[PDB]
Ligand SMILES: *[C@@H]1O[C@H](CO)[C@@H](O[C@@H]2O[C@H](CO)[C@@H](O[C@@H]3O[C@H](CO[C@@H]4O[C@H](CO[C@H]5O[C@H](CO)[C@@H](O)[C@H](O)[C@@H]5O)[C@@H](O)[C@H](O[C@H]5O[C@H](CO)[C@@H](O)[C@H](O)[C@@H]5O)[C@@H]4O)[C@@H](O)[C@H](O)[C@@H]3O)[C@H](O)[C@H]2NC(C)=O)[C@H](O)[C@H]1NC(C)=O
């Protein structure tokens with residue numbers, strides 16, 4: 021059994037550089053399956069699709085494998101000044117067109133990109149888990165602010181439409197950050213409000229596993245332990 025990870029710098033090996041790391045690097049210790057971290061810094065559901073990265077996973081994934089997909093951090097912004105990451109606005113079959121990198125690109129909505137990827141994998145017999153994005157430092161201002169982005173609800177909507185599983189990674193990380201407090205959580209963000217230090221990445225990976233155990237996600241089958249702090253919800 022192999023577990024494929026698709027995400028951005030919050031999940032990727034080496035995080036966003038400068039001594040930060042991604043949560044995907046701390047999962048293997050807790051699973052009895054091989055973990056393949058295909059997350060890449062700076063990608064959105066759009067650019068990950070355009071670069072052929074979902075396709076690459078589709079080529080090698082087999083029946084029984086898992087694929088965890090988590091995007092959102094790089095999916096917003098303005099299409100007016102196209103950075104190549106921003107998805108088309110909307111929750112369904114809306115299409116946007118923008119010239120980027122020498123191509124008049126057809127751009128889909130965030131849910132559509134995730135639904136299309138889920139369909140490719142599911143048809144081959146893989147188990148897909150769509151996960152909401154992790155939060156930027158919620159204590160950046162000295163007080164706790166719970167402010168989910170639109171991509172948290174979109175990931176949930178996508179899983180529902182594609183018929184796959186959903187793990188609310190956002191809520192589980194924000195719940196543990198709230199309890200850890202201001203000083204500790206700020207220490208997890210060494211250079212900006214997005215990229216976690218190795219300790220923050222470990223806490224973020226544990227929060228994903230807490231969410232899996234609490235919700236009864238299929239990944240439960242390859243977990244080596246259920247001893248993680250925090251509570252269900
Ligand atoms: C929530 O938790 C945070 C983190 O624990 C609390 O903030 C810390 O509070 C302690 C105690 O008050 C501060 O420690 C003091 O620091 C001063 C020196 O002044 C400061 O210098 C810091 C270092 O600067 C360098 O490093 C930075 C990081 O790499 C870099 O960005 C700089 O360019 C520079 O190279 C600096 O981080 C700090 O900035 C903060 O304060 C400014 C106030 O004017 C503000 O503009 C800025 O946005 C930051 O908030 C400040 O310049 C020492 O003289 C003193 O002895 C003591 O060690 C510590 O600096 C704070 N850290 C941070 C990250 O803010 C915070 O109080 C808690 N919030 C609440 C509401 O409780």
Ligand SMILES: *[C@@H]1O[C@H](CO)[C@@H](O)[C@H](O)[C@H]1NC(C)=O
Pocket residue numbers: 117118119124
């Ligand atoms: C991109 O393609 C769409 C649909 O084919 C078209 O309407 C639009 O004008 C094209 N963009 C440019 C800059 O030509």
